[PDB]
Amino acid sequence: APKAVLVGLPGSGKSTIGRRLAKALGVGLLDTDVAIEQRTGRSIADIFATDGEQEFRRIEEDVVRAALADHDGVLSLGGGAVTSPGVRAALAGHTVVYLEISAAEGVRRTGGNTVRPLLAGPDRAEKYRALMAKRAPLYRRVATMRVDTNRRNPGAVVRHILSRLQVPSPSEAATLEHH
Ligand SMILES: Nc1ncnc2c1ncn2[C@@H]1O[C@H](COP(=O)(O)OP(=O)(O)O)[C@@H](O)[C@H]1O
Ligand SMILES: [Cl-]
C-alpha cells in the first residue's frame, strides 16, 4: 500500500510534492492521471469526450484501486477521483495527505487568472473558486493528514509530511548490537 496518497486542488503541489517526497523516501511515484493514459492508450480528454465523465470516473476508480493495492510508494490522485464514492471507500485505511491551498494561491500556481470576456460572466479565478468549493470538502473527508501549502515552500511541506509518516524499524535494537 502506498506510503502516502496525495490529494488536493490544482496547484496544491501533487506533482512537486509527489516527486520530492518520493525522492526523500526512496520510493516509486505513480500519478493516477498518467496511469490512466498508460493503461488505456487514450488521453484523459479523449475519454471524457468520447465516453463521458461517468465512464472516466469508472476507469479512474479501477486504476486507483489497483494502485492502492499494488503500489508501495507515493501515489498522487487526479483531482476529481474523490468525487467517486467508490474511490472514497477504497481510500479508507490509507495514509491520505491533503495538500491545502487557497483559491488565490491555486490560481497563481496554475498560471494566473484570465480575461473576463463578459462583465456578467466568470473568469478563470471564479471557475477555480467553484472547483474549490465542490472538492475541498471531499479532500477534508478522506484525509488523514492535512498540510497548509500556502506559506510553506516545497521542502517545508515535505519535512512536515515526513515528520508525520515515520516508521520505526522493528529490527532497530538488533542493528545497534551487530548487521
Ligand atoms: N508549496 C509550494 N510553494 C510554492 N510553490 C509551489 C508549492 N507547491 C507547488 N508549487 C509550484 O506550483 C506549481 C504547481 O505545482 P504542481 O506540483 O504542478 O501542482 P499540482 O500537481 O497539484 O497541480 C509549480 O510551479 C510548483 O513549483
Ligand atoms: Cl511545520
From Swiss-Prot:
Its main location: cytoplasm. InterPro entries: P-loop_NTPase, Shikimate/glucono_kinase, Shikimate_kinase/TSH1, Shikimate_kinase_CS. Its EC number is 2.7.1.71. Substrate binds at D33, R57, G79, R135. GO terms for molecular function: ATP binding; magnesium ion binding; shikimate kinase activity. This is Shikimate kinase. GO terms for cellular component: cytosol. Monomer. It comes from the Bacteria. The phosphoryl transfer proceeds by an in-line associative mechanism. The random sequential binding of shikimate and nucleotide is associated with domain movements that suggest a synergic mechanism by which binding of the first substrate may enhance the affinity for the second substrate. Was identified as a high-confidence drug target. It comes from Mycobacterium tuberculosis (strain ATCC 25618 / H37Rv). It catalyses: shikimate + ATP = 3-phosphoshikimate + ADP + H(+). Binds 1 Mg(2+) ion per subunit. ATP binds at G11, S12, G13, K14, S15, T16, R116, R152.
